Amino acid sequence: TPVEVAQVEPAAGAVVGVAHPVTVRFAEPVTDRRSAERSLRIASTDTSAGRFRWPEAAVMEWTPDEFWPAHSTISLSVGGVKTSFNTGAEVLGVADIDAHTFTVSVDGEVLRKMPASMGKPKFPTPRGTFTALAKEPVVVMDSRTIGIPLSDPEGYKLTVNHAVRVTWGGVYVHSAPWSVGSQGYANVSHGCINLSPDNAAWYYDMVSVGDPIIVQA
Predict the structure, then answer these.
(1) Active site (annotated) includes residue 174
(2) Which CATH architecture group holds 90-217?
(3) Gaps in the chain following residue numbers (C to N > 2.5 A)
(4) One GO term of the cellular component aspect (predicted)?
């Protein structure tokens, strides 16, 4: 029994970051996943040069191994529905744990090399190539996410400004006034990428969902 394509992201005519994956939502939960995956056609792209995942029973996700070209129109068709979206500038944020820096560049031009503070050795910042998943003006960081009870001296529960979600695990780029004195010198966070309020606000206003974030040594 065949299945209909309900919704595709990014929406038709949307403008996203160069690392934004394609999600396809089907009308009914999918049985033959391998068939659903083969039904994805991307212009000038081979889907084997990427990775398929299934976030929900009815939604399919494809992430390219390389970034999309910036300032481009990406054309795809999944089964019947044919759509297309656009990419904006390549906005790359590189967190360097050893150097305690967060470097942001647009289309290869380095704009800012900002003092940052990554995770302390007990709670390190996970390394790899990530994607700005969400933008929240305010979010509550809860220490119970990483197994620290609020009754512990090292527990915490606080509101942070200008948060950019890096992982679904709970890694963020956010404003951390508490650690301004350590940013650029040592890593004192619980995993997040700590910036000054002005740098976090600057990065927040210029970043978009889908922009690549790289955490490295």
Answers:
(1) yes
(2) Beta Barrel (2.40)
(3) none
(4) extracellular region
